[PDB]
Each structure stands twice: as C-alpha cells, then as structure tokens.
Amino acid sequence: YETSSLPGRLLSVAEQTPEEKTSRITERLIWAGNTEAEKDHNLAGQCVRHYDTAGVTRLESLSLTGTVLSQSSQLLIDTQEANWTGDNETVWQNMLADDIYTTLSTFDATGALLTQTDAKGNIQRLAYDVAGQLNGSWLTLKGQTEQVIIKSLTYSAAGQKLREEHGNDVITEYSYEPETQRLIGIKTRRPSDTKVLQDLRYEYDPVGNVISIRNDAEATRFWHNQKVMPENTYTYDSLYQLISATGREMANIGQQSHQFPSPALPSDNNTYTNYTRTYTYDRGGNLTKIQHSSPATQNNYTTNITVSNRSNRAVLSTLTEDPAQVDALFDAGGHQNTLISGQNLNWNTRGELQQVTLVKRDKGANDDREWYRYSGDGRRMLKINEQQASNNAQTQRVTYLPNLELRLTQNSTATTEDLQVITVGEAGRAQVRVLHWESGKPEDIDNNQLRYSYDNLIGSSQLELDSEGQIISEEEYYPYGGTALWAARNQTEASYKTIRYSGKERDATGLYYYGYRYYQPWIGRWLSSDPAGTIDGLNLYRMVRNNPVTLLDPDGL
C-alpha cells in the first residue's frame, strides 16, 4: 500500500506457492493524482491503470457523473504470467499482446447508459421512458445502419417487463399474479402467422415454489408427428428440495454425461420422449442419486454420487465407490482435482480454474485442453480451447469484451474463422446476439445474423429465433442443467450456440461458468467451494439449495 504520506491506497499484490522462493507481482495499481490532465477527464484520484492476472486494463476517461466514457485493455501473451515488477513500464508492456481493445460509452446526466461502442466499432443505442425504464434498443455496425433490436417495451407497476417487442416482430407478454406480482407466465407470439411459439404457465405452491410448468403452445417442427408437449411437474419435500420432476427429452438422449448430443433435425424426423427423475439426498443435503426413467424407450439408469464421510466433497461414483477416497480427489482448498476419469483439473493460486485436460496424451504429443485467464476481479477475460489431434490441431480463442465476444479460430496450418459476437442486453433476460464475420463465414449462415433468445423463469435459454422470428434452435434441460432436449434448423447454426442453462456459457469441459465457479450439470454440484464461506448453508458445494426450478445464483458465490 502507499505510505502514510499518501492516502494509503493499494499499490500491489504479490504471491508465491510453498515451493517457490520468491513471489510474483500479480497485481499492480497506478493511481491518479491531482493534476489538470487528470481533472479534465474526471480521473483525479482514480486507479487509472490496473495490472492484474489477465493483463492490463486502463481508464481513458470518466464522465462528470462517474461513469466510464472510455477505457481500454491488453491481455497477457499466452506464455506470460503477471509479475509486474520494477518501474519499467516498457517491461510490463512486453508481457502483453499488442492488440488493444477499447470501449466507449455515452451516458445521460444521471449515468443511464445511452450508447456503447465496442472494440470493433459497432455501436449500441438505448431509449428510456418517462419512468427511466428502458423502452427500446438499436444497433449500428461498423458499416451498417441501425437495426432495431427491441422495438418497444412496457413495464408493470412492479417494474417488470410487461410487454416486450423484438425487432423480428416477436412479442412477449408477461403474465403476473397481482397478489404477489409474481410471474406466472410467458407468452411469445409471432404476428406474421400470429403463432404463439410458447405459452409457459408456472403453477406454484404457497411458498412460491413452482410445482408445475406447462407450455400450452403447439409443439414445434422438430417434434416429428408430435403436437402435444409434456407437462413438467415437480415434487418438493418439506425442506424444499426437488424430490422429483417430469418433462421431456430427445428420444435418443440416452445416458446423462458431459457429452452434448447433436441437435434434433426436423429433416431427420427426430422425436421426443417423456421422462421422470427422482432425486435422493443425504442428510447434509447432498444429492447422492438421480433415478432416471423413460419407459417409452426404456431408458433407465441411476446417476450415483459418492459423498465424503468427512466432508461434503462428493464425486461421481465412477471415480470411487469409497467416501474416504472422495476427499483425496480434491485439493487442500476444496478444489476438484479431477473432473471425470481422463480429464484432470489444474486450479490456479486464486482458486480459479486454470486448465482442464480434455484428452491426455504422452511423450511428444500435445494434450487436448482448455485453459483460462481471469482478471483481478475473477471474471473470465480469455478462454482458450486447444485441440491437438495428431492430424488436426486447432485453437479457439475467445476474448471477453463489453458486449463482445471475439471468437478467433485457427488451425495450426491456417486461420479458419473470425467471428465477432455482439451482445444486446443480458443473458437470462432475452439477450440478443449478432454474428459478424471478418473471415470464415459458413456458406449457409447470414453475416450479422441475429439471434434472439427467449428464456425461462431462471434465465435458461429455450428458444432462439432469427430476424424473421423463425426458429433457429430449441433447447431444454433436466432440472440441474443437463441438456434434455436440443434441436436446430441447421447444424451450422447450432454450432454457434454457447448460452444455455441459467443463461450461462457452457464450456468444452461441459461445465457452466458462473462468475466465480464452475458448475457440473451431470453431477448437480460445484467444482470448488464457495469463496463466500457459509453465506448460505454449511455445504460449500451445494447448487441452489437443491431447488433449481425456483432458485438461481448468477455468481456462484
């Protein structure tokens, strides 16, 4: 920290592991003073430059309301680690990639966001009503006129979305029960054929837990010869754990695992079947068994979890039948050592996941793996997926920028694709994505293709429509986020969907990234303990108090 001659603000963070002789500077902060140049851009006294584990983020300027007018950043070179030593600014620069990303924004006088410019030059614009509520949204691209993403939005007295109209003419109505003003249903209609794509009714117990969800809309084209959708019913115990549930799944979904099925295609005459699942919990609230049954296909199995007899650490039983051994499958801080047999986990010094080995190879072979860089606040800044087949190595680089995913895919032999994904709004809140290509666009996909997501009660993405309101894809989940149902118009289009259960991104590890932790949907728990400590319960691996139907935790903290 600064010495007492100065306020005492934090200047750096350094760390070492037990086997290391010295520490590395993982974080460093450059603080603004009281000079005119700083005052002129509203930066006096601010931490303008933030050196962290991902790279360096720098403010360029602030509004007189304290919002960011402009900022920019650089990430660390794939082979470098933060060690922001000395006073050599150049040296620090040398640890970074030369690409600089910048974001600019316009705010109203109270700080509402009015516009935002991404690092490529695409610009968002938002409208607000007399109540200061958002009432519409527009997007211009570098080289394109503004499109209307949201044509209109009206809110309830409770400030909840009441009527949402999308640029693709799709209108969603929100039905609330005025006694509590709780959402009781979502109705999505396409005026060109006035087709209600969905009508999701939520039926509740006295607490407010959903005991039934029913889509009264006609089944979609992906359901061959099937027009009537199954009802999702739920049973909860006195502790409100989910004891049982019903729904539907791909007829050929099979065994729940970390694998993700190909989508059903209407052209293949794919169909869906019914299912019921039963959830067995121990007295510590750990899910120990999931009984799966679909008598129609005779898909019958039980997911079995071995729970520690010393701790609440628990693993899929295939990694050990012995509660005593379960503890050895975790490191000293509760981080999972191994995900599945064959896929280990490298946790970093911050408790963040550094790397998943996807395929272990030996000698001179390179492993298939996925690895991550996070900023000093724990948010993921960069995801790298590395495929190393002996005849096919490929790197998938995803840079996380404000409302922008920079998806760069290269083969060890060639650049194959450059896709910018512009996001509008928030995931889990009917976020719309735009797929823009600089290179490698598929011959069958639209450049600047719009993807409008329609989400369920907890933000899971269920439908995705194009600019004409046509269905691109459809997806559902087993209550803990397993994928139960998945369909698409075109497999090419299907390949670009990354946002699923809870509105979270699903990795190649099959895991969902939630802020601070990775969620494992085929086991129903977290891969690391909650950094918040006993914020809610003494079980640091429990997912949503065992009731995902009604509960949601966006941070996993």
Cβ neighbours of residue 277 under 8 Å, at least 6 residues apart?
A: 244, 245, 246, 290, 291, 292, 293, 478, 479
64 DSSP assignment: T
Q: Judge residue 493's burial from the number of C-beta atoms within 10 Å of its C-beta, 0-12 exposed, 13-18 middle, 19 or more buried.
A: buried
For the CA atoms of 208, 212, 216, 219, the dihedral, rounded to the nearest 10 degrees, stands at: 130
> Which H helix or E strand runs over 89?
helix 89-93
Distances (CA, A) of 453 to 288, 432, 503: 33, 6, 10
Give the C-alpha separation, 139 to 118, whole Å.
11
Give the C-alpha separation, 423 to 32, whole Å.
32
Which token pair is 509?
């590890």
* Strand extents, DSSP E, 251-352: 272-281, 287-294, 299-307, 314-316, 338-340, 343-347
Distances (CA, A) of 232 to 110, 279, 295, 521, 549: 44, 15, 16, 19, 10
Which token pair is 110?
């109270």
Which string of b and e fits 400-422 if b means at least 16 CB within 10 Å? bbbbbbbbbbbeeeeeebbbbbb
Q: Experimental method for this entry?
A: cryo-EM
Residue 352: half-sphere exposure toward Cβ, Cα within 13 Å: 21
Which token pair is 33?
């003073």
Residue 230, φ and ψ in degrees, nearest 5: -65, 150
> Which H helix or E strand runs over 325?
helix 323-326
Give the C-alpha separation, 27 to 47, whole Å.
12
Distance of CA 488 to the CA centre of its chain: 20
Which string of b and e fits 301-329 if b means at least 16 CB within 10 Å? eebebbbbeebbbbbbbebeeebeebbeb
Give the C-alpha separation, 198 to 250, whole Å.
19
Cβ neighbours of residue 387 under 8 Å, at least 6 residues apart?
A: 368, 393, 394, 395, 396
Distance of CA 50 to the CA centre of its chain: 25
Give the C-alpha separation, 450 to 437, whole Å.
12
